[PDB]
């Protein structure tokens, strides 16, 4: 077992975090465009 | 099992400040690239990239009175036939004489350092 | 999903709420077992 | 699809009512342990037979309707059995949840109150269900229904539509012989009649009620191939329909061969009945040899009707009668031939799909979907669907000898229909045939071959004809500055429109210039110059990052919400980049991939926006060296913070340059120097891009925050400067009250700034630890006079 | 740092993951109700 480890998935659920916001907000972008 | 004693030599030159220190003051980036930067210039030169990640860092528990010298230790990646090697029982016993030999080294850096 | 075989099921189980979702998940190549400790982490509230 | 799962977990906790606890946020990480692309879902289903049968209340309606569901056949059944009994056996699980089931319907209850088969008619309605399931599926392709006349014109299949009390005992062993061969050819007898059934259910039998009981008995043991005769006209005529597959009209016909010769086998009776020389026991002492090769075939087709198999379910059905017809050899073998027929159309298939790559299902059969997608959508759209729902994978209509393997094969299927969407397939250089058989390490083996030959065909013609490495050094060039001279010749010209308001410009002004700079200039080494183009950003970089970054903590819809219309936009707030890459060439330009791209040029262009208005200042301030070197001290101690803040541009700028653009950069060079695959590309692409994605800073929302406030800051006090330098030219309200000494105001707002902004970089980045920290805020104290004071901004803190 | 730290950080990103999953599902849900 490690500590750093748990330091890079920390990198990693941030990096994951920040493609799902950008798909998130690229899709309420559409949302809006379209609905709207 | 402790062998290799460049990088011991490597975590007396830079961890002095930060081991020396309680645990309450942990650092990982500087802990992490202390290794990395040690490794090509110590005998460990030689240690595989494939070696440098069955190795790794790891921590114990908390308690802050503790200097990090003899708090601070490190971790290994034990990964499939190595995994059914080092069991986690063995990987117990592998740590707690890493454990034993830390706490020696230590006092015998601590002896060389006075 | 089969949802008439899965009701047969239920009720040829005469057992003790449809809870299809896992059922859903179950063909969702989802492990016979990781959800059964699941079922004990979620029963014990 | 995969937050469906996600959705599933918080729907069960809500189901479950489950308060105490984390939830279902680490059960979902063992679901996320316990997902496969294959499945092998089975138990020892003896074992959990037993274990269920332990352990239920009424087991005879239980074991009936086991039984039942396994003759369905249904999908995760068993792996149902395999929770099933693991429930059971938690106990606890079981008390807690049997507790949750009973409180989930009281609660559904309060909630509620305060607010016989006909076998032909049967054949004829799924003949009507299997025709509007293939056209309505086909949704577009001509369906061969067969004529009207088959379903009319009865009898086309060919199965069945004297005193006998008082005849002699030989003489009735003797004509209950010849009745019996008129009733084994589907016929009526003279003592023995047959009826029709109904539903898919055997020919009622009825006999002389005044024969001989014995003679009666041996007849009704003899009569058991009957109905496996009639059944097997039925089954042989039923399934020859192309609406019950073309596939199984070919399983039909093969059965149509064995029961040819058990028609043959029949004649060959009559051939020692012409001779007058029959005998009960030699009829019988041969009729045992043949019922049992009847019989099994019976039961196989029996099931692959009442399973309704088809596809690739139908080839798993087949090998699984296979492995459960293993044991007798008599039907063993008989069964290796039957699957080897069959495999004949279902590898014809997959070879089509894969040793050709061209699927083709008339019936849609195969595993391997292609779902029918524009490829326009995907070059302007961020959301990418051709790479993904282009070539969909059916689950049911998959055979189980390649579920391990189905995955690489579906794989291949995608680059094989990916060359013939680019206009460049070719049979592969090696075509050897599938053929059928119980081992499946053949079959893995020829896929791991196919496979490794895919890729070295696929991976070498999109790293050839498409040449994408090209078009990612023009992606440096161009889109991630790194053209000299074109930045030069970008800031002598679109400094005049991007001067203008948003609205102020006119984007034909804009294209114009975007040509003349590259015919001015001398970066022609651009041979798909024409990939680049100007887009308007309807928001800022930092505004629609601001309003994305917070999102589902405080700004979901407290700034996510906010529109541009309402604020004014700035003539370089709007500029942007575009881009063209071809659907089948270059389709690796995908619209959320451009959007990364001019986000990170847009971060730069308003860094180098900002730079050349800082070095323009300071050229504008270029009287100091012949002025007063103390009476411009109103303008010494503004040159003196002209570098302050020209040494934090610079710094901010190099730093993302060198540690954010190089390594990312670099990284994916070797990554796709070394990639395998279009996944593997993918990857490499996403360590320049994901990586990206914090290599320059960009997921902190304070730090964002911050650090726009410091532009915005910088940005007003070059603004009243250039007011001032202007008005100090001229002489050689708000902005001519923007001189009053206003670099002591400027300094404490900036300073202000850039206090938060190295406290951010000391705590937020201690709490990220990283090397970006070391690299900015011990970048930001290069000397004594810049750490000192920051020293005890730190203590103040 | 500290190794709570960590552990507490890493709670809160596997909640906020879910969550994040939770509204992309949404999302998705609702650009499957309009464009479809």
């Keep these: ?36 | 099992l402790l062998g290799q004693g460049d990088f011991i030599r490597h975590l007396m030159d830079l961890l002095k400040p930060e081991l020396v220190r309680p645990a309450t003051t942990l650092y990982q980036h500087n802990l992490t690239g202390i290794l990395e930067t040690a490794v090509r210039a110590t005998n460990a030169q030689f240690d595989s990239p494939e070696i440098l990640k069955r190795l790794d860092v790891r921590l114990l528990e908390v308690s802050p009175g503790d200097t990090g010298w003899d708090v601070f230790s490190l971790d290994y990646h034990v990964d499939g036939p190595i995994a059914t090697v080092f069991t986690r029982e063995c990987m117990s016993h592998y740590l707690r004489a890493f454990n034993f030999l830390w706490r020696a080294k230590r006092v015998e850096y601590i002896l060389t350092d006075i | 999903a089969e949802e008439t075989e899965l009701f047969e099921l239920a009720q040829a189980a005469g057992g003790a709420e449809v809870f299809k979702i896992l059922v859903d998940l179950l063909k969702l190549n989802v492990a016979p077992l990781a959800v059964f400790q699941m079922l004990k982490s979620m029963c014990a509230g | ?797």
Excluded at chain 4, 334 to 354: G, M, N, Q, R, V
Excluded at chain 4, 527 to 535: A, N
Aim: aromatic share 10%.
């Design chain 4, 1 to 797: 699809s995969e937050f469906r799962i996600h959705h599933d977990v918080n729907e069960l906790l809500s189901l479950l009512r489950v308060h105490g606890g984390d939830g279902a946020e680490v059960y979902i990480d063992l679901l996320q342990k316990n997902r496969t692309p294959y499945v092998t879902t089975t138990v020892s289903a003896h074992s959990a037979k037993v274990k269920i049968a332990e352990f239920s209340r009424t087991p005879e309606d239980f074991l009936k309707k086991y039984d039942e569901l396994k003759s369905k056949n249904t999908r995760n059944l068993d792996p149902l059995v395999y929770l099933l009994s693991k429930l059971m056996e938690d106990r606890e699980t079981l008390q807690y949840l049997q507790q949750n089931a009973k409180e989930r319907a009281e609660l559904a209850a309060s909630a509620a109150a305060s607010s016989g088969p006909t076998w032909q008619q049967s054949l004829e309605l799924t003949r009507k269900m299997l025709r509007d399931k293939q056209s309505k599926k086909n949704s577009g392709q001509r369906l061969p229904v067969l004529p009207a006349w088959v379903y009319e014109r009865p009898a086309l299949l060919g199965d069945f539509l004297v005193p006998i009390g008082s005849l002699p005992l030989a003489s009735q062993e003797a004509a209950v012989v010849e009745d019996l061969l008129y009733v084994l050819v589907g016929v009526d007898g003279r003592y023995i009649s047959a009826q029709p059934l109904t539903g898919r259910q055997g020919r009622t039998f009825l006999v002389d009620p005044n024969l001989d009981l014995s003679i009666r008995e041996l007849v009704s043991r003899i009569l058991p191939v009957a109905a496996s005769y009639s059944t097997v006209t039925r089954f042989i005529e039923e399934k020859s329909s192309f609406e019950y597959g073309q596939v199984n009209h070919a399983l039909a016909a093969a059965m149509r061969t064995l029961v040819k010769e058990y028609l043959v086998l029949v004649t060959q009776l009559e051939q020692l009945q012409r001779q007058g020389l029959l005998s009960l026991q030699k009829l019988w002492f041969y009729i045992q040899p043949a019922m049992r090769s009847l019989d099994i075939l019976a039961s196989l087709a029996t099931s692959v009707d009442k399973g309704e198999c088809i596809g690739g379910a139908t080839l798993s059905l087949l090998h699984d009668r296979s492995f459960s017809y293993t044991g007798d050899s008599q039907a063993q073998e008989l069964c290796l031939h039957l699957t080897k027929a069959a495999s004949t159309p279902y590898f014809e298939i997959l070879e089509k799909w894969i040793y050709r790559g061209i699927i083709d299902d008339p019936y849609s059969e195969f595993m391997v979907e292609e779902h029918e997608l524009r490829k326009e959508k995907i070059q302007e759209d961020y959301n990418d669907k051709y790479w993904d729902q282009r070539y969909t994978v059916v689950q049911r209509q998959i055979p189980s000898f390649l579920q391990k393997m189905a995955g690489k094969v579906l794989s291949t299927g995608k680059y094989l229909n990916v060359v013939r969407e680019c206009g460049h397939d070719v049979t592969c250089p090696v075509a050897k045939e599938v053929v059928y058989t119980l081992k499946e390490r053949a079959y893995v083996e020829q896929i791991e071959k196919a496979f490794s030959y895919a890729s070295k065909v696929l991976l070498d013609f999109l790293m050839g004809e498409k040449e994408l490495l090209a078009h990612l050094r023009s992606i440096k060039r161009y889109f991630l500055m790194d053209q000299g001279d074109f930045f030069v010749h970008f800031m002598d010209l679109t400094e005049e429109e991007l001067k203008k308001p948003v609205d102020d410009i006119t984007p034909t002004r804009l294209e114009a210039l975007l040509e003349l700079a590259l015919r001015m200039s001398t970066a022609n080494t651009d041979p798909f110059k024409d990939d680049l183009k100007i887009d308007l950003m309807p928001h800022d970089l930092i505004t629609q990052l601001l309003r994305v970054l917070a999102i589902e903590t405080q700004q979901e819809k407290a700034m996510v919400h906010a529109d541009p219309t309402e604020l004014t936009l700035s003539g370089l707030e709007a500029f942007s980049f575009d881009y063209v890459v071809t659907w089948p060439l270059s389709l690796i330009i995908n619209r959320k991939a451009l959007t990364r791209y001019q986000m990170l040029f847009r971060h730069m262009f308003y860094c180098k926006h900002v730079e050349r208005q800082l070095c323009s200042v300071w050229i504008s301030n270029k009287a100091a060296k012949r002025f007063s070197l103390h009476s411009a001290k109103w303008f010494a101690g503004a040159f003196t913070l002209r570098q302050r803040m020209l040494n934090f541009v610079q710094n901010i700028q190099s730093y993302m340059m060198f540690e954010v653009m190089e390594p990312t950069w670099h990284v994916l060079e070797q990554n796709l120097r070394s990639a395998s695959n279009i996944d593997d590309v993918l990857g490499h692409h996403a360590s320049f891009l994901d990586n990206c994605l914090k290599d320059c800073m960009l997921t902190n929302p304070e730090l964002l925050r911050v650090f726009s406030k410091l532009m915005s800051v910088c940005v007003m006090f070059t603004n009243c400067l250039q007011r001032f330098t202007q008005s100090m030219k001229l002489d050689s309200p708000q902005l001519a009250s923007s001189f009053e000494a206003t670099i002591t105001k400027f300094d404490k707002n900036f300073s202000a700034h850039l206090l938060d902004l190295l406290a951010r970089l000391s705590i937020y980045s201690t709490s990220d630890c990283e090397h970006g920290m070391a690299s900015v805020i011990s970048r930001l104290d290069f000397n004594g006079f810049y750490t000192e004071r920051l020293e005890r901004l730190s203590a103040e803190r």
């Design chain 1, 1 to 36: 077992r490690n500590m750093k480890d748990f330091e890079n998935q920390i990198t990693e659920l941030k990096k994951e975090n920040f493609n799902l916001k950008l798909r998130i907000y690229f899709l309420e972008e559409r949302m809006q465009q379209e609905f709207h």
